[PDB]
Amino acid sequence: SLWGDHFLSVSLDRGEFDELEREIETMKPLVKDMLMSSQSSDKEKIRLIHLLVSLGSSYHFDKEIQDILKHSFTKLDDIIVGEDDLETISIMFEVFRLYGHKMSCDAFDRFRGEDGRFKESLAKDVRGMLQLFEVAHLGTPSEDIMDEASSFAQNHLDSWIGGNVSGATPHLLKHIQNSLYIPRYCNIEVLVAREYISYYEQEEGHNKILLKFAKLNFNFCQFHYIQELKTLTKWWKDLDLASKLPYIRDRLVESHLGGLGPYFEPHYSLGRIIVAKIIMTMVVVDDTYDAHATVPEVAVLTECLQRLNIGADDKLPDYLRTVLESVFEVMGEIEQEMRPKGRSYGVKQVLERFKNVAKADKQLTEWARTGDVPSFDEYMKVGLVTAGMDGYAGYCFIGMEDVSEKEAFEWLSSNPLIIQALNVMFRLANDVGTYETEINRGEVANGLNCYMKQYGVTKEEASQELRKIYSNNKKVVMEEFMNSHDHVPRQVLLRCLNFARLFDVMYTEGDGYSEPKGKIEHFMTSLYVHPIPLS
Numbered sequence: 400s401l402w403g404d405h406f407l408s409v410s411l412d413r414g415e416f417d418e419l420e421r422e423i424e425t426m427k428p429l430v431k432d433m434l435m436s437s438q439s440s441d442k443e444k445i446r447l448i449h450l451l452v453s454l455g456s457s458y459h460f461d462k463e464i465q466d467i468l469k470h471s472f473t474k475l476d477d478i479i480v481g482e483d484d485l486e487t488i489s490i491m492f493e494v495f496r497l498y499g500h501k502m503s504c505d506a507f508d509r510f511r512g513e514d515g516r517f518k519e520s521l522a523k524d525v526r527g528m529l530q531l532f533e534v535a536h537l538g539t540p541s542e543d544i545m546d547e548a549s550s551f552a553q554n555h556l557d558s559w560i561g562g563n564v565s566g567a568t569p570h571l572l573k574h575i576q577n578s579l580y581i582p583r584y585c586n587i588e589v590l591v592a593r594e595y596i597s598y599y600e601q602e603e604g605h606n607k608i609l610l611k612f613a614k615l616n617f618n619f620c621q622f623h624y625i626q627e628l629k630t631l632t633k634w635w636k637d638l639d640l641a642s643k644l645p646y647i648r649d650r651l652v653e654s655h656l657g658g659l660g661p662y663f664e665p666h667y668s669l670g671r672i673i674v675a676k677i678i679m680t681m682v683v684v685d686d687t688y689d690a691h692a693t694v695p696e697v698a699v700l701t702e703c704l705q706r707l708n709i710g711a712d713d714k715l716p717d718y719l720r721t722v723l724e725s726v727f728e729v730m731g732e733i734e735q736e737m738r739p740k741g742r743s744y745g746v747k748q749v750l751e752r753f754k755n756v757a758k759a760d761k762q763l764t765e766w767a768r769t770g771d772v773p774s775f776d777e778y779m780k781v782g783l784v785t786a787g788m789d790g791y792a793g794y795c796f797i798g799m800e801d802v803s804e805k806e807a808f809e810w811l812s813s814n815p816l817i818i819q820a821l822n823v824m825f826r827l828a829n830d831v832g833t834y835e836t837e838i839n840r841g842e843v844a845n846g847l848n849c850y851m852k853q854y855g856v857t858k859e860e861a862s863q864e865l866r867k868i869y870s871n872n873k874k875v876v877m878e879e880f881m882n883s884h885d886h887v888p889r890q891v892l893l894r895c896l897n898f899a900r901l902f903d904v905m906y907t908e909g910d911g912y913s914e915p916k917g918k919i920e921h922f923m924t925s926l927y928v929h930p931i932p933l934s
């Protein structure tokens with residue numbers, strides 16, 4: 400709607416594409432030489448890996464990076480003996496855990512007083528505190544030291560900002576303000592890269608190869624997203640549900656972000672398109688589960704979603720028939736596209752996994768239609784089904800050629816705890832963040848409203864309460880993300896962690912929660928419109 404016209408008419412020069420692809424391929428060997436240098440230490444390699452992570456460029460070298468870290472993790476106790484640099488320990492902490500190696504929080508005891516707290520002497524290390532702050536968002540459920548590290552660096556970094564000196568180094572100041580507002584692991588990979596490029600450009604001594612490589616890499620990535628949004632807009636318009644339905648909302652860029660969060664790299668382009676098509680479609684089905692649909696309509700709609708057919712013509716009203724027909728047609732076409740690539744089984748899973756989302760959605764509708772506000776505890780039993788994180792992960796698996804089909808779906812239907820925790824996060828983040836919309840539409844059965852109902856707390860007190868439930872399940876996702884390495888493909892685990900990080904950017908606003916449309920406007924043009932000018 401808003402941006403649909405824009406993407407349809409933006410011009411992508413295939414010659415610009417080909418040149419970015421070539422310059423990237425031309426520089427890749429030089430960067431690779433840096434990682435495999437026999438002259439740099441393990442510490443120096445970890446520093447570089449983190450820099451390639453920061454710049455959204457690690458994936459070009461994922462085989463090498465994983466191997467470097469598998470080996471030097473075995474040497475980690477030795478690498479850190481007498482390593483007293485706060486930012487160095489914190490950088491190793493980020494790199495090793497991001498790559499599935501659970502580096503112990505005992506690493507920070509060297510920065511901790513006898514009281515127990517982190518030494519006040521750390522306040523001179525403005526960079527160390529920033530990197531400590533960032534890694535405090537990588538804690539497992541038992542590591543309460545990280546919540547104390549986050550509070551320590553934040554307050555000590557806030558003091559620096561409000562004071563005297565912080566002025567003198569503006570580019571660093573701005574980077575720290577950005578990081579405190581949107582922590583790296585509360586942000587998605589490509590936006591972290593976008594901002595770190597601006598920051599790295601202003602660091603005296605920045606490597607010019609890596610900077611230029613990161614810019615080329617970002618502009619290449621962004622070229623794909625625009626082409627993907629263009630493709631999706633054409634697809635959505637040819638489907639033309641807007642002509643046959645009244646209540647269709649504009650979820651184009653939100654739906655693309657639904658693929659972009661999980662994976663930003665160019666080789667996941669097709670996967671992003673598949674995910675965005677499925678989301679825009681299933682989102683129409685979810686809007687159809689509406690308190691203003693009657694008992695017979697919702698009964699028949701739910702039943703058609705169990706059978707996956709048409710009705711007989713033994714059935715009900717027109718807009719509702721149009722929606723079921725479209726869903727079956729969209730999913731049938733996607734399955735046909737994916738059949739040559741031997742991935743049609745995964746497309747089939749979409750509507751199979753959705754059958755229980757539909758039955759859950761039917762119950763939600765009865766609550767809203769009668770105006771019953773359940774207990775919070777009883778609401779969630781339905782709400783974690785409707786959250787569908789197992790379905791969401793299947794969508795992303797479809798366009799990932801190196802995730803064996805029955806490997807991945809084995810896992811999902813084994814109900815991994817990581818998918819359980821993601822369900823809590825999405826359900827809570829979505830219902831609090833969209834609360835004003837929900838009350839407007841009469842959806843009074845929701846996570847926030849049921850918690851106020853149960854505990855007599857106000858909206859703000861319930862907001863804070865479900866926040867903590869949300870933080871806890873995020874730590875569960877982190878610990879599950881690490882513990883499942885060498886048991887679950889890393890490619891699969893990364894989508895899971897990116898779900899968590901995507902939910903922070905879409906929904907979290909300071910200490911409570913907000914609507915994603917407002918959050919998307921903050922990074923819309925830098926992500927989808929303007930390339931980085933190349934030095």
Ligand SMILES: CC(C)=CCC/C(C)=C\CC/C(C)=C/CSP(=O)(O)OP(=O)(O)O
Binds near residue numbers: 653786901
């Ligand atoms: C992060 C993002 C935008 C998309 C990924 C989430 C997935 C997999 C599907 C979209 C779910 C829905 C219906 C969002 C609509 S706002 P709502 O309050 O109506 O959603 P609900 O109906 O509560 O599920």
Ligand SMILES: [Mg+2]
Binds near residue numbers: 685686688689
């Ligand atoms: Mg609904």
Ligand SMILES: [Mg+2]
Binds near residue numbers: 829830833837845
């Ligand atoms: Mg909701």
